[PDB]
DNA sequence: TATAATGGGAGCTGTCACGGATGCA
DNA sequence: TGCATCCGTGAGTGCAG
């Protein structure tokens, strides 16, 4: 565009403020793409919603915040020796034993059952008075034969194994200790996995954590007007955003940082100028800064 | 072409907020002010002087003008200068320069977003001395007030709180610039009182009321006299170019004499006096026709009582008051021959 | 100062002729 | 390039009014 040229208002907003277009989604319907996501024209962003330009989509208002909280603990399982595969760990989905015929996994203490079911798989915890006695781990293929809140003595069947049994996919086998005795081995696996707890964000509140951020106990996820109805992070986990109000498909260029930023929000800038971090990160394009 | 459909169109571009974007922008504006005096007591400069600098850099150098009230002239050198001992702070202190900047940016989108609301209020204050747009702009003017005073935490929509400052600001303009003769906003307020109460009186009586029928229903401290002189200051002037006749070859102003400047009769009548009285000082004595020519003025007047009379006349204080009598005396006999003075008393 | 309120409203008519500046096959 | 076509500018005097 040359000196002494007549631009309409929109034209001037493009050249001076840049293209961007926000799209609403049917309330509840989730995001076929997700936050931070670079995308381009005609690309499906939700069942009925598709973008008509290029750029870096951004989430507006997540109504559903899910925290995958992290667990690392110790659980055991006894199996026939001629039916388990030897490995010192079990990547998720990884087959760890196969049983010729069904074999019943029996108790090795007495107490009340604390059943803890997972997407695929299950935990079983026994306890005489409210101290724990044992933590058994049912993999995939072992079908529990108890209910939560239930009494078992030594040696009655808890689960039944049938055929192949494999690790679940959310769950890891960090280290695996085995010990033979009789015609069985009893693994104490150092399992690792995470659990979903879905939080609801309300119109007068604002999630204050990015996508995939790490938090400890205490850390604040959502804020609100009154200190109640805030969501604090129960303990260690990391965050996820589903169900935004709608998503803004900007045409910009993102540049993460690690330390103090040298440019504030509002600044005009060209390529090559020093954005943040002592001069490492720098501008690709001509454009308009948004810290 | 039509300067209202024009503005009705620019407005129709900024989308209306939704409940989250409402509370988002409002929230950011609140926090940004907090940020600004946290940002003030760290560096110790001044909240406002600091606020204008946030303001400049967000809107662009497009606008900057030495803001009345700030102590230094806010020229683009002091905005780089001061934006410097700003970005000079630790990431946990210069944390708030990003907060302010975000605030000012949300200030705007929240004003710009809610202009269609002002329109829908000024629309019904028409025909009151101010034009639609004039009313809109005033309306807007108040809207700005509404954001710097909003409290998103009270949970009310924005519409609700602003519909107060908006009409508060129309109504102050309708009442401060409408009349060619500006009358304090409170006198304007009581005037409208007479109007509205007179109207009901008429709707009650079947005829317009008298002065006293107003002073009664207007209550105590109100007499007929005081309703009357209130109405005559209520009185709006009229155009010198008002049309006289159904043609247009005479102006109401053309039938209005110019009382101020002297007429040629008067102009001449003055010059013949102020010398045929100089034609009665140099007739008997010109130093007694000079000390009483300085007991008043040939031009400017010189007359007090006893004080400069006592300074430089040559003579003592109550001796000039005696040749004051004889200077006058001589003129009262002097002016029984040159009797050409009586006419000048009209 | 706090429910909520979010794009206007009235056109005016029955002259004419010339000269200039602009749009269009 | 030549010619519709629109926009802007004029349209008597004085006196009573």
UniProtKB/Swiss-Prot annotation, chain A:
Boundaries of the shown chain within the full protein: 147 to 437 of 1524
Disulfide bonds: none
Similarity-based family: Belongs to the RNA polymerase beta' chain family.
UniProt organism field: Thermus thermophilus (strain ATCC 27634 / DSM 579 / HB8)
Summary of subunit composition and partner proteins: The RNAP catalytic core consists of 2 alpha, 1 beta, 1 beta' and 1 omega subunit. When a sigma factor is associated with the core the holoenzyme is formed, which can initiate transcription.
Role summary: DNA-dependent RNA polymerase catalyzes the transcription of DNA into RNA using the four ribonucleoside triphosphates as substrates.
Protein's name according to its UniProt entry: DNA-directed RNA polymerase subunit beta'
Swiss-Prot record, chain B:
Compartment list: Cytoplasm
Region: Sigma-70 factor domain-3, residue numbers: 189-267
Primary site of residence: cytoplasm
Region (Sigma-70 factor domain-2): 110-180
Key words, A-Z: Cytoplasm, DNA-binding, Sigma factor, Transcription, Transcription regulation
Chain intervals for the UniProt region annotation (Sigma-70 factor domain-1): 1-36
Gene Ontology terms describing biological process: DNA-templated transcription initiation
Keyword presence, Acetylation: no
Any one Gene Ontology molecular-function term assigned to this protein's record: DNA binding
One GO term describing the cellular component: cytoplasm
Positions of the DNA-binding region: 306-325
Segments carrying motif Interaction with polymerase core subunit RpoC: 134-137
Protein family membership: Belongs to the sigma-70 factor family. RpoD/SigA subfamily.
The protein's assembly and partners: Interacts transiently with the RNA polymerase catalytic core formed by RpoA, RpoB, RpoC and RpoZ (2 alpha, 1 beta, 1 beta' and 1 omega subunit) to form the RNA polymerase holoenzyme that can initiate transcription.
Entry note about domains: Contains 4 domains, connected by flexible linkers. In the active conformation, the domains are in an extended conformation, each making extensive interactions with the RNA polymerase catalytic core.
Protein name: RNA polymerase sigma factor SigA
Organism: Thermus thermophilus (strain ATCC BAA-163 / DSM 7039 / HB27)
Residues of the full protein shown: 78 to 423 of 423
